[PDB]
């Protein structure tokens, strides 16, 4: 009566799991600097378009990336998330603005040996870095991008310092209160757990390996010009006066209510 | 399978933004009312299409608009951004639902003179206005659109009152919590800043030029039905009333226990 | 010339484009064979488990079946329904033979139910949900204790509200999770009451007096009379207390283990 | 919509009959890697079970017919989903747990095995993974549906896992639709059968099996969760990060003085 269907044995293995071993080291030379800087300068609009369609971004005469929403995870190297796309392109630019990068086998910063010395076009503007008070030409300019946390494997002290700046200067950076302090650091802490094995390693050990003085120097540079523009003050003054208006309206709100 | 759109490389520069003057007064008569109301009722789907291609929107038998993303906005009169397009079509409907508009020469509202009496087709639905508790036929119905802030130059007290409502009832309107309170008012403040010159003018001076009584009239109208619409207040009232009922029944319950 | 824009044809968004048809139990009043619908209801837990994997076809009489599905794809089709609507339709089919009266909203009163054939639900079919409240087979309320019962408000408002009252009061006795706020308990009923009573322009006391607070109280007394505890539920509650006692005992050993690591 | 037909079959007092189920009737039916492979597909077997009864071949000599709970039988090889998973789990754990319980001696005797078998370490248990276990852990294949039936063989280990489920229910993605009593009810039912809890105390039961054994297993399982918690790492990070930012005040003032 039970009429059972046969179920063939088929174990769940690593082959059936998500093999996401993403490293920026497989993408170090795919950018034409001014091209990837341009794509990064349009990160807001690229994200708006990504809501509707997948994107194809040409990054050099020899390479392109296919940008997806993460749910479309694929082993194919040049199919990537939005944050991975942004990190890959930023790495292509920062190769020419940061003199040093991290060697995890030597546990130290080493010189980035760059055959070709290229200056990113100083006329390409990064609105995210401009909100911080950074100006075009700053070496950190093209690090202020979505998914910057993936850069931790190349520039750990610089990436952590920016995360620290986001944590301290929430309000100057227009970060919503919906974002807890954990929301700010969680992406970075995932990257740090991958490299440092935080289950078996402490945060003190990780921070001393990359060097707190390195983090200190980057934090000072990134925080130097954070503040408020005239627009940010006008918006803050408006909110306070708009709530004044809302308050002065309640007599008439309850009067219309009685009727 | 992923069908990606090609994204043309075009860097953001200081020349990227049209800082050019925009006045709704050169678009006052281009709409056939029900046609523009029909486009506005599809604002969500038009924006999705706009990510892939520019849009040609026929607004009457004499006029059309070319819709582009913001960085492609032009001095060309019929090439407009998404928000300007929606504002233009909203003004075309609102000229037949709002009796008065603002004259900045005379610092007062004047009567809108309409050759033709036209009622917007009450069967065209504004999903955005339903979220706020407005029903079709309400004179404010087709002001609840993207880029409504551009309407400030015609209906300043009404536009401000809606902004006040968006600030106070953000959660009721299911505004994403990714948006700060400054995000909610920024667009309006920018338009108020161009017209009132808020670097040499006070918010109080601006608010008394348009009239705090007028803002109050409109705030009461728009705020009225959000309150009576709150799912959360109905449920809270119910919980208290329900517990009052349970207290009512305790004598009957004890009497039943004895029998 | 270079913008090359695509043409967008005018096509207004209407109520034809929303299409939320009004669901009424009045279009399903005679589709049940009583013992068949009570049996489907007696397996609501297992029907719900099966719906996670596949859509369901439930035969309700020799002339009718329902197709139960998760999140109706704008189902305008009458026989294609949600789990809660399917459960309410089958519950109404049974309660037509156990409740003597139903509500007439044009008369604002309860009226007699026109039943030519009086059928007794098979008393051997057990409702585990009603048994958890302390109800016994044969109770007229037995097959009201079902998922999606709130839809029955349009036929039995005072009985549906009274059950909601028992759920709100006796959370703990009825194994209701803390993840369910008190609003979560009443929200579906309040949506039904809003649709019928127009609660934007009517008070809760207006609504409660039209259906009748004495009607609510009679039903509340019936449903709350036998609320209590089984030996099993005290065992679980004692187990939870002792288990936490153990967890506290072990905090020395866990701290000792962590610094060692 | 391709609906499945659901046969009408009322729930009665007949639908469930209390019947003795002992894992001791099934101790040698598994080929270890085969049962581990079935357990590794527990989620997919459950989805299949909603539509059809399943036949699972567990060795070259044996198979189980898996049915929904109300179709459970006294027939040995017709079993519920939870019983099937527990039978296959005991088959794997016989070669990973060194000791099992003797309820006539009221203590853990040694598991004697003719053949030394190691479960294929490349078969993955997804639910043991989110708990923070890694393949090769002796507890790896206890983290299965219906594990509570294993109390008959590994009472301290089963109780310890139930303890971890109660405390760290958020870390283990346990649905919040479940009460704390939902988490322990199945274990208490089995504890009630063996210990006669109406005429026995919990304290009596836990002393028979040994509170020391329970603690040992509890610490093992609880430590792997702690180190695994994403929320905990983020909280630690924020504390360390606030300290670091305070560290930088002298360097910041030095830069503020240079800027002026």
Author numbering:
A (entry chain B), B (entry chain D): 52 to 310
C (entry chain C): 51 to 311
D (entry chain A): 53 to 312
Q: Can you quote the paper on this entry?
A:
The trypsin-treated N protein (NΔN45) was then purified and screened for crystallization conditions. Finally, the structure was refined against a 2.28-Å-resolution data set with excellent statistics. The crystal structure of RNA-free NΔN45 revealed four NΔN45 molecules in the asymmetric unit that were organized in a tight tetramer, as was previously reported for N proteins from other members of the Bunyavirales order. The C-terminal subdomain of the core (C lobe) consisted of helices α4 through α10 and was followed by the C arm, a 33-residue-long amphipathic α-helix. The putative RNA binding cleft, a positively charged trench, was formed between the N and C lobes, and as expected, it did not contain any RNA molecules. The FMV N tetramer was organized as two dimers with 2-fold symmetry rather than having a 4-fold symmetry. Each protomer (N0) interacted with two other protomers via its N arm, which interacted with the N−1 protomer, and its C arm, which interacted with the N+1 protomer.
Like all bunyaviruses, FMV has a segmented, negative-sense, single-stranded RNA (ssRNA) genome that is encapsulated by the viral nucleoprotein (N). The N protein serves as the main building block for the RNP assembly, protects the viral genome from endo- and exonucleases, and helps to evade the host’s innate immune response.
